[PDB]
Amino acid sequence: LTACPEESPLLVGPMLIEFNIPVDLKLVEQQNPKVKLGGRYTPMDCISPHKVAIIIPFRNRQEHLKYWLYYLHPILQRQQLDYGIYVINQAGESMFNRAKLLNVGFKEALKDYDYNCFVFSDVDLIPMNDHNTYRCFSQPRHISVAMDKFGFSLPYVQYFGGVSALSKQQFLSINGFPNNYWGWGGEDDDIYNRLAFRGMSVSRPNAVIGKCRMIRHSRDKKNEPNPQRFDRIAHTKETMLSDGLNSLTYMVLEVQRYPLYTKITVDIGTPS
């Protein structure tokens, strides 16, 4: 009935994170009885000013999603967020297009609730310290700051890929994310150039609180390294104006509401 406190009293700190044990969503569903159809939860104890839509770009990685949901749901509920989970499944055989799917997530999530904050998360990154709140701040927030893939270190100061959070204002301010990055690499850097070109600076939790594990996996033959990324990240200033929220077109082939998550398969086209 009263606003949720600044810091949740439910936090534990560092958690053991492993992908050795198999997951059973039915168990997960059982363990998280408060999650409602669609992967929604709203703290009933206090009122969270954080209305967060979590968006996961996706394609043929159902196993990762299992772990993601297994760890993430208990954490997000403990951080006292009013959230919703959205998996943006890419239909087709064209190279993976992360940023674009993140754009779809933004639009689709909005159709469901008055969300004011968006966290964009790869399906294979899991936070190791619930103090790394999955929400928005006064500036764009980078969350996968100390990934084990990088020795629990920030690989480079301009790094914004992995998992991040932008408020609606912030996301809207840069015309969202680009749509023309097909294949691996650069789009997260392009997004970084945007936040920069709009006078915003990236905020991050320290290297300890931001530790994260990543489920390693065999290279994706459908997400080959994009040959054009090197030239494209050099023109954001010009292109963020023509390629972004304002140029987003896609076709929703199916909307699936599972008890733990909303899955939206879309046809985002082909490398035009």
């Binding site: 301009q158 080959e224 390294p225 040959p227 090197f230 050099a234």
Partner: protein
């Protein structure tokens, strides 16, 4: 093998300053070129780039797939996929001396500023 910035840094000391490129710039370039993965192999447009430096078989090394390029480096492409970096470095220098740093497209966009972060204080 995925090397660390410092491991890479210490291995290439002899390329430092060559053709004008410092160690800090190379550490940056390499991170954005192969992610320090000595075994990186990226194939596109009918040619294949190998290792830490992503040296292509189109002109530089001999591959069984594209058996007769100029093999300017005088080395088998599979040689750029182990943990012995001397030949890789020897090859890269030929590239720097012949084509220049622009061979490495990661250079201009990610390594024009904020170089200090690329330094390795480890002796």
């Amino acid at each position: 093998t995925e090397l660390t910035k410092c491991k890479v840094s210490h291995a290439i000391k002899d390329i430092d300053g060559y053709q004008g490129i410092s160690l800090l710039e190379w550490a940056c370039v390499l991170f954005h070129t192969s992610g320090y993965d000595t075994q990186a192999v990226v194939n596109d447009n009918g040619s294949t780039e190998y290792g830490l430096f992503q040296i292509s078989d189109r002109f530089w090394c001999k591959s069984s797939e594209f058996p007769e390029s100029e093999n300017i480096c005088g080395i088998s492409c599979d040689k750029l996929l182990d943990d012995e970096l001397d030949d890789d470095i020897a090859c890269a220098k030929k590239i720097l001396a012949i084509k220049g740093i622009d061979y490495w497209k990661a250079y201009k966009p990610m390594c024009s500023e904020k170089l200090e972060q690329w330094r390795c204080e480890k002796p």
